[PDB]
């Protein structure tokens, strides 16, 4: 991974993201979303991630 001052920026589009398989993973120290409840990301439709 790149440094904090050179934070790596990636654009993802035209994909189907299954946030459930990331949600149930317990290996993450923090899993915290602001504008959306984490359980409904798979129920939302957007672009330009």
């Amino acid at each position: 991974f790149a440094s904090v001052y050179a934070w790596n920026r990636k654009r993802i589009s035209n994909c189907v993201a299954d946030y459930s398989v990331l949600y149930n993973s317990a290996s993450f120290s923090t899993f915290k979303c602001y504008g959306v409840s984490p359980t409904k990301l798979n129920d939302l439709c957007f672009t330009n991630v």
């Binding site: 949600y23 149930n24 984490p38």
Partner: protein, 49 residues
């Protein structure tokens, strides 16, 4: 000194009914694992001060 006695409900299984009171204070499972009265991963206290 900070007013902390004022709390609000933060999580529930579903939305309330008109003029309905909820006083139950039980751990809420945000994920796919049982909580068993433990406020840990994917488990949260529904009341927030």
């Amino acid at each position: 000194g900070g007013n902390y006695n004022y709390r609000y409900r933060l999580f529930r299984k579903s939305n309330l009914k008109p003029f309905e009171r909820d006083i139950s204070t039980e751990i809420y499972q945000a994920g796919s694992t049982p909580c068993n009265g433990v406020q840990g991963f994917n488990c949260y206290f529904p009341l927030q001060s």
